[PDB]
Amino acid sequence: AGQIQVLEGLEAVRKRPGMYIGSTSERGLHHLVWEIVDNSIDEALAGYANQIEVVIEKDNWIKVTDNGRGIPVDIQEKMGRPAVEVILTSSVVNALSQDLEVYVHRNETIYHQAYKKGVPQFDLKEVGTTDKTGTVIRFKADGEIFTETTVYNYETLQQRIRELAFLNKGIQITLRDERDEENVREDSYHYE
Numbered sequence: 001a002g003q004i005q006v007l008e009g010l011e012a013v014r015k016r017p018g019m020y021i022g023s024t025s026e027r028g029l030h031h032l033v034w035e036i037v038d039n040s041i042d043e044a045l046a047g048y049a050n051q052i053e054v055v056i057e058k059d060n061w062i063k064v065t066d067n068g069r070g071i072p073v074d075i076q077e078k079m080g081r082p083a084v085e086v087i088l089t090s091s092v093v094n095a096l097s098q099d100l101e102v103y104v105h106r107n108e109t110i111y112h113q114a115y116k117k118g119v120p121q122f123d124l125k126e127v128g129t130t131d132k133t134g135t136v137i138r139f140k141a142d143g144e145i146f147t148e149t150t151v152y153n154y155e156t157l158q159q160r161i162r163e164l165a166f167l168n169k170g171i172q173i174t175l176r177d178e179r180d181e182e183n184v185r186e187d188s189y190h191y192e
């Protein structure tokens with residue numbers, strides 16, 4: 001019933017995405033970033049993270065990285081699935097992404113899962129080891145949903161990232177554009 005409710009939720013989001021994110025215009029595209037960044041900001045506010053990095057990658061993938069605890073990976077009571085999978089298959093961003101990947105650094109282990117339109121492509125796996133903790137989310141917005149544009153605007157991202165860093169003092173928030181490998185731009189914000 002839990003996994004069935006998962007699937008019904010992804011169907012709902014993709015049927016009326018503007019009810020979830022405001023619009024499917026350029027403003028809704030950028031909203032995807034804000035939803036992921038806000039989760040990392042909560043982790044900083046909780047006392048566990050202090051660095052967030054937003055990267056516009058080739059082909060308008062977005063990568064958000066924080067140094068928090070790592071999304072948990074323990075098997076749940078409710079779903080019988082790893083906690084990170086439950087969290088990400090209930091995420092609006094995941095539903096509205098043609099592809100999304102997570103890497104969790106936790107328990108000295110690197111865990112990976114990938115999804116398409118919110119559907120896990122394989123079970124969460126251990127892919128490597130680590131001496132850090134935190135979370136990496138990489139997504140590509142689904143052009144079937146975002147029919148006007150899937151191209152991010154650096155200055156739109158920059159203006160809100162700067163605002164977030166100013167509002168959440170002590171969090172280092174970095175924006176980087178890698179879409180043109182020949183001219184990479186980066187702004188990094190860290191108040192007080």
Ligand SMILES: O=c1nc[nH]c2scc(-c3cccs3)c12
Pocket residue numbers: 039040043066068069070071072087135
């Ligand atoms: O730490 C996080 N970074 C990004 N997204 C999420 S969603 C849930 C969490 C965490 C909950 C508890 C530890 S990490 C995070």
Ligand SMILES: [Cl-]
Pocket residue numbers: 071072073074106107
């Ligand atoms: Cl865990």
